[PDB]
């Protein structure tokens, strides 16, 4: 079956479904992109990481599935500032 490998697809090589990024509702505060590595983050004040919040599902999907490796990641489960509620929200959504 003809496969144009010039076009990149992360799903080709990721065997662990929890390693895949997916968009979920963050109740109260919009949408977020999540995986086992944590949430996709933006540089929040003090040059730290805050969870990236999207107003719409489509902005989340577009941002997640766009082109770049989405380097900035905030993980609440292993950070020295562990957020146990935001970590439980993470593993509930995976």
């Amino acid at each position: 079956p003809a496969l144009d490998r010039r076009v990149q697809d992360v799903n080709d090589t990721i065997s662990d479904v929890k390693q895949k990024w997916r968009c979920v509702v963050y109740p109260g505060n919009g949408f977020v992109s999540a995986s086992i590595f944590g949430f996709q983050a933006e540089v929040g004040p003090n040059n730290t990481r805050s969870i990236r919040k999207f107003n719409t599902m489509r902005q989340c999907i577009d941002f997640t599935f766009s082109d770049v490796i989405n380097i900035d990641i905030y993980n609440p489960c292993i950070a020295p500032n562990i957020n146990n509620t935001e970590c439980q929200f993470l593993k509930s959504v995976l």
Binding site: P1, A2, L3, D4, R5, R6, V7, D9, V10, N11, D12, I14, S15, D16, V17, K20, W21, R22, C23, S35, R58, I61, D62, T64, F65
Partner: protein, 134 residues
């Protein structure tokens, strides 16, 4: 002297013609089945992310030919978003992304796929055209 050059070359060119006639007749059958299936359904002509078990495909029916067509991946076959479990929300969302952003590149089962890729997708399980005709 090699003994049946002309008569074998003619059987081969007629073989290629018979391949193309079988493809066209299958295309026609599937097109008419498409017309009969499409009846009474909305968004049959709109791309939808369809779960084939091991992967998602963004597909629809053509408005003209009525054949199944899918979002194409580069210069190859339909874009098959590989799943890593029975439930893979990430693969599903990526397929939705393909619908919103990559839908100008489309490939149609049958004659067009034969022209573009050298096979029709029909009569070749587990290819997605065959699964649809099943």
């Amino acid at each position: 002297p090699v003994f049946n050059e002309l008569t074998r070359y003619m059987r081969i060119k007629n073989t290629v013609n018979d391949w193309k006639s079988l493809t066209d007749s299958k295309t026609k059958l599937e097109s008419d089945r498409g017309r009969l299936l499409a009846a009474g359904k909305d968004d049959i002509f709109e791309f939808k992310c369809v779960d084939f078990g091991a992967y998602f495909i963004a597909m629809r029916l053509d408005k003209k030919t009525y054949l199944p067509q899918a979002i194409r991946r580069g210069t190859g076959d339909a874009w098959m978003v590989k799943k890593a479990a029975k439930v893979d929300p990430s693969a599903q969302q990526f397929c939705q992304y393909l619908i919103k952003h990559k839908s100008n590149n489309v490939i149609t089962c049958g004659n067009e796929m034969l022209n573009e890729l050298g096979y029709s997708g029909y009569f070749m399980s587990p290819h997605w055209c065959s699964d649809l005709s099943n």
